[PDB]
Amino acid sequence: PDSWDKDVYPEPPRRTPAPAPQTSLPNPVTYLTKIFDLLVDRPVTLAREFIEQQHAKNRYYYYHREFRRVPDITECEEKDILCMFEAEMQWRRDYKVDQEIVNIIQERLKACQQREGESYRQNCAKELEQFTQVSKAFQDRYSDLGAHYSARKCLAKQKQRMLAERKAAKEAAAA
Amino acid sequence: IARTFYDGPEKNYEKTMAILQIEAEKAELRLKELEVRRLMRARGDGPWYQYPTIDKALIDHSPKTTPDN
């Protein structure tokens, strides 16, 4: 339904074949489906309609909380505890959001694998590539941080990686 | 439950900021106090570690039966 965004959680257009009976024998699946409709789905639909009618008479809202952007650990002085605190809280929020981004991509991958049946190896290549890219970026950001990870340790890891990349590029320019 | 038993995140956030400021100031004060104690005990030019000497008002500045003190 329209509860979730279809761009964040995409699905193919869902082609289904038309029934093409080839025998005069009655189809038990259709008869049981009609019985199930009449004895299960209609009462459930009526109950839900009543509940939604009650919900309509009492309509209230909740909001998504917006967080400002505070300075990060890069422009905090060595012993400034307040800037360090706010930068660390912002970094923790960013870490949580990155985890949920990876979660969304993994959900896409799983749904693709189930949906494609026997053709999943070829038909889920884009989802596999997206998960590979996201997983590599996440591994670069947060792996090996340890039990007591902090924005300072992430900064040190990034600086070490930047130094390695700079040295590699410098020695590649010499070859 | 949130309305009845709890407060918003701002209260805890800013209380944490105040607590952190107090603790950091205490830490720097402790380090400075140790350094000041070390310097005063080494040089003796401060109000602390002022060990007594002889009071000069006990000296008798009067002629002493002999000219050469």
Ligand SMILES: CCCCCCCCCCCCCCCCC[C@@H](O)O[C@H](CO[C@H](O)CCCCCCCCCCCCCCC)COP(=O)(O)OCC[N+](C)(C)C
């Ligand atoms: C519709 C049916 C389903 C509803 C189920 C609701 C689930 C909740 C029921 C369980 C009880 C919760 C446990 C109580 C722990 C709360 C303790 C504390 O957090 O509450 C204080 C508040 O005190 C409350 O009054 C707690 C009182 C709970 C006492 C429990 C006693 C129940 C025992 C039952 C005895 C019945 C009779 C016995 C006969 C012998 C908070 O202090 P305060 O700083 O102010 O609040 C700050 C937030 N402000 C600023 C918005 C106000």
